[PDB]
From a paper:
To aid the interpretation of the cryo-EM map, we generated a high-quality homology model of the STLV-1 IN/NTD using the SWISS-MODEL server, and determined a series of X-ray crystal structures spanning the catalytic core domain (CCD) and the C-terminal domain (CTD) of HTLV-2 and -1 IN. The IN/CTD structure was determined in isolation as well as in complex with B56γ. In the co-crystal structure with B56γ, the short linear motif (SLiM) harboured by IN within the CCD-CTD linker is clearly resolved, bound to a groove in the centre of B56γ; the previously characterised binding site for endogenous substrates of PP2A. B56γ is recruited to the deltaretroviral intasome by the LxxIxE SLiM motif within the IN/CCD-CTD linker. We previously identified B56γ Arg197 to be critical for binding and stimulating the concerted integration activity of HTLV-1 and HTLV-2 INs14.
IN first catalyses 3′-processing of the vDNA ends, exposing reactive 3′ OH nucleophile groups that it uses to attack a pair of phosphodiester bonds within target DNA (tDNA), resulting in strand transfer. In this work, we determine the three-dimensional structure of the deltaretroviral intasome and characterize its interactions with its host factor, the PP2A-B56γ subunit. The deltaretroviral IN host cofactor B56γ14, as part of the heterotrimeric protein phosphatase 2A (PP2A) holoenzyme, interacts with a number of chromatin-associated proteins and potently stimulates concerted integration activity of deltaretroviral INs14.
Numbering used by the authors:
A (entry chain CCC): 212 to 218
B (entry chain AAA): 26 to 109, 123 to 142, 144 to 294, 299 to 372
The structure:
């Protein structure tokens, strides 16, 4: 439930 | 008293808001005499509780002056030296939980990270990371999310963090030091990994091979395994090419908790390119044909559930020639 980060 | 003189904010100003953070820096003893200053403890509890209901419910209250005041406060409470099977819990959770809550300020719509960048720097982010060795799960839970936010909002630290997590895993696998917040750290990476840009920078490619795979080999793997699996399958999804040393790595590092492997593998198979499947079908199946027999029962059943997978059974169909003889007839 942790949002993906546009690395 | 013993922390000045204040009260709820009906008045409206920010200077009051400042002072509350500031007397919320007054620390208390929850350990070496839990029964001390109970009235004062409750005040501090209420104050934090106040500030929270405030920052969530009324806009344009975060404002240039308060940034350093908020940070400073989070600094003064959380950055401490930690004590050392069933866990130890933070005696001070009744305060420290709200300091965790309150600091998520990070998520308030009018958080301008441009002002924040001044105070939420590398010196901070480090000692934040230092706290991931907390035995108390519900603290780690808080750090996991907190640190997540910081990454996704301060492009400026994205770099630095990556290095620092590297240097934890490296010390964890090699330098042999136990590092205690690995399942949380790993859940972070999954979302950093999902967001990775194409093509995978060969650095990421390498971290897979030198850090992510060796984790399988460690004794406590069960304790963080779900999240490890995610990172792996997130790689094999970004670049379908790494399948070859990934699966092999896994089969090498293979055994009980055979089941977890069995999970990771299906989750790996779910994303496998046909041309990449062939690369490992032979060794993979020899292994799997063993599990269907594996005396440990739930191992076998789990090995069985592969055959219910429509894609997996296509892949076998496509290749039944070489795969099928890896059962009897």
């Amino acid at each position: 439930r942790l949002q993906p980060i546009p690395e | 008293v013993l922390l000045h003189i204040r009260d709820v904010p009906p008045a409206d100003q920010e200077k009051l808001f400042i002072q509350k953070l500031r007397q919320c820096c007054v620390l208390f003893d929850f350990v070496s005499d839990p029964l001390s200053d109970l009235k004062w403890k409750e005040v501090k509890r209420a104050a934090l509780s106040e500030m929270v209901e405030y920052i969530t419910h009324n806009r344009n209250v975060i404002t240039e002056p308060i940034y350093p005041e908020v940070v400073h406060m989070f600094a003064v409470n959380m950055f401490r030296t930690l004590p050392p099977d069933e866990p130890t819990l933070e005696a001070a959770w009744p305060h420290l939980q709200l300091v965790y809550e309150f600091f998520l300020f990070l998520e308030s719509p009018d958080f301008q990270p441009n002002i924040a960048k001044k105070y939420i720097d590398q010196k901070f982010v480090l000692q934040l990371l230092e706290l991931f060795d907390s035995e108390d799960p519900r603290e780690r839970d808080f750090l996991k999310t907190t640190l997540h936010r910081i990454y996704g909002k301060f492009l400026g630290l994205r770099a630095y963090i990556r290095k620092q997590i590297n240097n934890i895993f490296y010390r964890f696998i090699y330098e042999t030091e136990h590092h205690n917040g690995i399942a949380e750290l790993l859940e972070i990476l999954g979302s950093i990994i999902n967001g990775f840009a194409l093509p995978l920078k060969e650095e990421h490619k390498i971290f897979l091979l030198k850090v992510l795979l060796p984790l399988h080999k460690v004794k406590s793997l069960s304790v963080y395994h779900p999240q490890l699996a995610y990172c792996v399958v997130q790689f094999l999804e970004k670049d379908s090419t790494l399948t070859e040393p990934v699966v092999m790595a896994l089969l090498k590092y293979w055994p009980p908790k055979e089941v977890m492997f069995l999970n990771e593998l299906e989750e790996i198979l779910d994303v496998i390119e046909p041309s990449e499947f062939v690369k490992i079908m032979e060794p993979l199946f020899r292994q799997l044909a063993k599990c269907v027999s594996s005396p440990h029962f739930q191992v076998a059943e789990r090995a069985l559930y592969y055959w219910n997978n429509e894609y997996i059974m296509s892949l076998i169909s496509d290749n039944a020639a070489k795969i099928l003889p890896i059962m009897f007839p």
